[PDB]
Design a protein around this ligand. Sequence first.
Ligand SMILES: *[C@H](CC(=O)OC)C(=O)OC
Ligand SMILES: *[C@H](CC(=O)OC)C(=O)OC
Lengths: 127, 127
Amino acid sequence: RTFSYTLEDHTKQAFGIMNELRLSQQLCDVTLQVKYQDAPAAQFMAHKVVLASSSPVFKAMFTNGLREQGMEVVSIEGIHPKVMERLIEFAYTASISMGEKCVLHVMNGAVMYQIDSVVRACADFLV
Amino acid sequence: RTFSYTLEDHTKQAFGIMNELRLSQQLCDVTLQVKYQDAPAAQFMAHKVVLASSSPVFKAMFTNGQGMEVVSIEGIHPKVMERLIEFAYTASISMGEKCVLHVMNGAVMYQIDSVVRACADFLVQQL
Ligand SMILES: *[C@H](CC(=O)OC)C(=O)OC
Ligand SMILES: *[C@H](CC(=O)OC)C(=O)OC
């Protein structure tokens, strides 16, 4: 015989504690310090492989070129730090929430990182 | 207003992506050297944050006292460790009726309860 088993919500629960390691700052190999014009500078430590799984350009930033081992500090410009936080959380919890006055900026931030499931969610909200 | 959105198929897609990354040895920080009793020694590369997301033992291992790490693994077979690692990235596992005990023992070593309870429920069928 051949017995097979598939835990359905495993990916839901596995992502649940990958978010714990991000908040507890464990196993992190990238630090996204993002500074925006007329905005307080911020820092978000995350995991390269889990951000690569949610964004093709996050995947491209970390897979090619000469990357720093251990932990790589990445300077990011162009998006507000309060928008990058919305994107990183979506990459860890598969959900995103905000007010009606920021869905435009979050859409532009999600287009740059090609998180297409968010650019279509922000588009369906504005219709 | 308040915008909210949850992509349901996200965690399934993201795991399929970082499964492609482990099959191409990108963004990996582990080399699991499996040394069993007179078995052909095999090696498996994976991510600390992914193995920690599916195994409490792997979480306690990688979160203690950086960079790339090579860990020796003994007491487990390469093919049952390979099946456990594939479960971490695919949430699925498949064995033969003659290998259900050697995988339940491998899963009980790393406290992957979902695989343990499934294999233990298989043995009570023929009992
Ligand atoms: C928007 C802030 C936000 O999205 O809160 C969830 C913003 O930064 O204004 C430009
Ligand atoms: C081998 C099953 C086994 O008993 O190894 C511990 C196997 O099915 O490989 C796919």
